[PDB]
Design a binder for this molecule. Sequence first.
Ligand SMILES: CS(=O)(=O)c1ccc2cncc(NC(=O)[C@@H]3CCOc4ccc(Cl)cc43)c2c1
Ligand SMILES: CS(=O)(=O)c1ccc2cncc(NC(=O)[C@@H]3CCOc4ccc(Cl)cc43)c2c1
Lengths: 305, 300
Amino acid sequence: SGFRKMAFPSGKVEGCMVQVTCGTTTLNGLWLDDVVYCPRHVICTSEDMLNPNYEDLLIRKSNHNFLVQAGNVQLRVIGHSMQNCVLKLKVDTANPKTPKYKFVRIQPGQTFSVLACYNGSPSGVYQCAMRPNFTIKGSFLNGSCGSVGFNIDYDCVSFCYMHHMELPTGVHAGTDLEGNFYGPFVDRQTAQAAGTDTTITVNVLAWLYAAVINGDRWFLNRFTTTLNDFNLVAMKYNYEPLTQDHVDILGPLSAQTGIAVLDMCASLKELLQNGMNGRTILGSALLEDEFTPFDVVRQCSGVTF
Amino acid sequence: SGFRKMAFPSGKVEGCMVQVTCGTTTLNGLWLDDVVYCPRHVICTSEDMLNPNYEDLLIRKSNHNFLVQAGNVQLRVIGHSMQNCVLKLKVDTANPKTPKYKFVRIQPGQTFSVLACYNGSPSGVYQCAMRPNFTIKGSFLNGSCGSVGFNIDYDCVSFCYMHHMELPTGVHAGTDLEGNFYGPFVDRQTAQAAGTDTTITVNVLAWLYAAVINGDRWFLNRFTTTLNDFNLVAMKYNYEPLTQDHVDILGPLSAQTGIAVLDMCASLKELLQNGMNGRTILGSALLEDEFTPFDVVRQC
Ligand SMILES: CS(=O)(=O)c1ccc2cncc(NC(=O)[C@@H]3CCOc4ccc(Cl)cc43)c2c1
Ligand SMILES: CS(=O)(=O)c1ccc2cncc(NC(=O)[C@@H]3CCOc4ccc(Cl)cc43)c2c1
């Protein structure tokens, strides 16, 4: 029993974290095989961040300008190239701790674990979701750039995020491992704001199923709804539309609990229109949307890595 | 900016997780140097649930009865001894991935990371607090016994918890790494119940300081309170008494935010009386008590 926000074990990723120093900037790098991946803004000064020409700044750099440190061992940079907003530093040594990995770009609503690092050293692991406005509500201080987001599927690490910046509201913006930003963000010091966020509906439903599996049933009702009528209510309350794909994905949880997805949607509709009335669900007075249906099945069944 | 429930990176502990099988029972072991630590109840049969005599059950065991598996490699048990509720299996190989470590017994209110494991394999990491009633609100299924709780403040792993059992309310009880249970619990299936839980007051205050550091101030007020008046109010909402030790511990956060502890206590009294009125604090509609003052300073 119990339901916690749970991250993947971070060991496979900890063995890849390195410190990248370029001039006065120090941030984190991801060392996989003989390449160190890090945010391209490591080559910027304070003025170079205001209006940057990264091709021009990079051409002026030499391999010895990049100081890569893996623990207390300095790695030798033998090449450098840029792929979108990520800098790739070719090193003379393949990381012996390189796990089986893939670079995957995730969709909003998908969750992943973040290994927050400072000076190439892991300091914390937490779970979060890619918000529908493409920001993440992370926990990052100065020096955390280059920290990565990942999932594990069997023994393969899927790297899905690299930290680049903090927006004025305190939320975070970053890229996939190919350097493509999630959201309409740019890696420069300019006016940028996160769009109005919405609730990840399929994830709330998954968390309501996790609550039922854990013995919390007060919110269940005799009613059902059409998918279209539910989406009218969801639009009203700044909730993401629920698709037939989401209904299908929730199938196993629906079969296990005996509560059809549209039956759980009618419970969610009542919670949205009436609130919790002083009650909690899984120790929360708000509807939680950072657990996907796969996370709920993984935690309530005990899948290992 | 931002404030998340954050666990320590689990890599140093993952390299210590092994599977321990004894008869029909399989659970997790912690492999440090040449010793595998695990709950002694791994030696219990179906008839030794209510009143096991662990000394008697253990004397009947031989080293080859314990099957220890580290990955796809079977370790050879060359000795076995019991220390309180923990079984120590001497193995013929020192774990090459043994980190720098310590065994520390924690106090209620203290937080730690849990590396939940099944069959010696890590499946997830989450952050817990030792509740004032000495239980933990974990997420554990059957097979999670032997999963450990730890802190990794700089380089060294401090092991503070080993999972042993789930109480009827779905909360969890376990021991420190010396086999001493936290709470009045025993490793028997005899009727046991967690006492009435209370809120870790010093941790709620620490989290209110974290919210102020992060820009939230709506809950602040112009009032202060005596420590005694705060305790008289707080105990009516099942909050733990706030001691002078707790007031002192909150000193640095008080200095950093400019809000005296007793001033923040008056905000907490007001929140308890009024609720949040549709507002949130750090993305939460409830007062969070699983962040210590040390966690808040660490994360901010
Ligand atoms: C308040 S601070 O010390 O600037 C700070 C605090 C927490 C922080 C948490 N994650 C990242 C930070 N860095 C940034 O966002 C850099 C600082 C300058 O502004 C930009 C603008 C664009 C880009 Cl691509 C990067 C940055 C953080 C920076
Ligand atoms: C209901 S279950 O499948 O037995 C179960 C479910 C979740 C569980 C989550 N953590 C631990 C479990 N194990 C226990 O509590 C064992 C079996 C039951 O009785 C005792 C009594 C004393 C001790 Cl020291 C251990 C146990 C769990 C056991």
